[PDB]
Ligand SMILES: O=C1Cc2cc(Nc3cc(Cl)ncc3Cl)ccc2N1
Ligand SMILES: O=C1Cc2cc(Nc3cc(Cl)ncc3Cl)ccc2N1
């Protein structure tokens with residue numbers, strides 16, 4: 001999971 | 005396009 | 009010896025979401041309490057262990073309406089349906105419990121994992 | 131303020147390809163000369179300008195069989211259908227001309243672009  |  | 013187009017899967021998902029927003033080729037309505045959500049059975053199956061089981065059933069595969077368990081929160085379902093079609097999860101302090109519970113019921117293991125991690129941190 | 135799961139789109143496409151290999155929820159047969167190819171209309175639309183136009187047509191959207199132009203090569207179509215479901219293109223010296231021609235007809239602009247580049251190099 002990432003910060004888009 | 006890439007070499008997978 | 010194939011070549012690969014890096015953005016292909018993302019572009020496919022983006023176009024499937026555009027079809028969903030325009031209600032094109034949607035073949036099922038998911039009923040969550042009073043709320044109704046139109047979708048594509050194949051996308052639901054690709055994202056959820058529960059929908060995979062439902063639509064591979066020789067009888068349920070032909071249903072145009074699926075009613076979820078009355079304990080399921082429509083907002084939690086909406087957030088998860090958006091994630092299915094975009095890879096983006098709107099996880100907030102006020103919805104995390106309903107999102108984790110809905111993801112556990114829908115059998116969306118990666119969403120359950122990030123919810124458990126975010127809850128543990130607080 | 132969403133979070134994003136990097137592998138989600140690829141995992142969705144992988145599961146849609148698994149459904150295709152097992153002939154699950156396929157809703158159309160594409161006829162190319164004597165050859166028949168089963169697929170999901172939504173995936174075909176998401177990948178091809180031609181299938182997007184066909185299945186948004188109020189009459190053609192309901193057809194279970196689509197016959198392609200007799201000039202279309204079944205192998206070129208097969209290579210492109212595999213690319214739609216995997217992001218992987220089996221581009222070879224012996225098939226590049228048939229693949230480019232089929233991609234132009236199907237309106238798959240990124241495939242047309244790499245075919246033109248690979249032809250130019252030789
Ligand atoms: O967390 C999850 C997400 C998920 C998706 C699917 N859907 C498929 C799985 C396979 Cl092997 N082939 C085809 C499909 Cl559509 C099943 C279980 C789960 N669990
Ligand atoms: O090279 C290409 C690939 C492609 C895909 C699609 N399919 C869509 C486009 C839009 Cl805007 N919304 C929904 C869909 Cl399914 C149309 C044209 C082309 N050209």
Ligand SMILES: [Cl-]
Nearest residue numbers: 116117118119
């Ligand atoms: Cl997931």
Ligand SMILES: [Cl-]
Nearest residue numbers: 238239240241
């Ligand atoms: Cl393309």
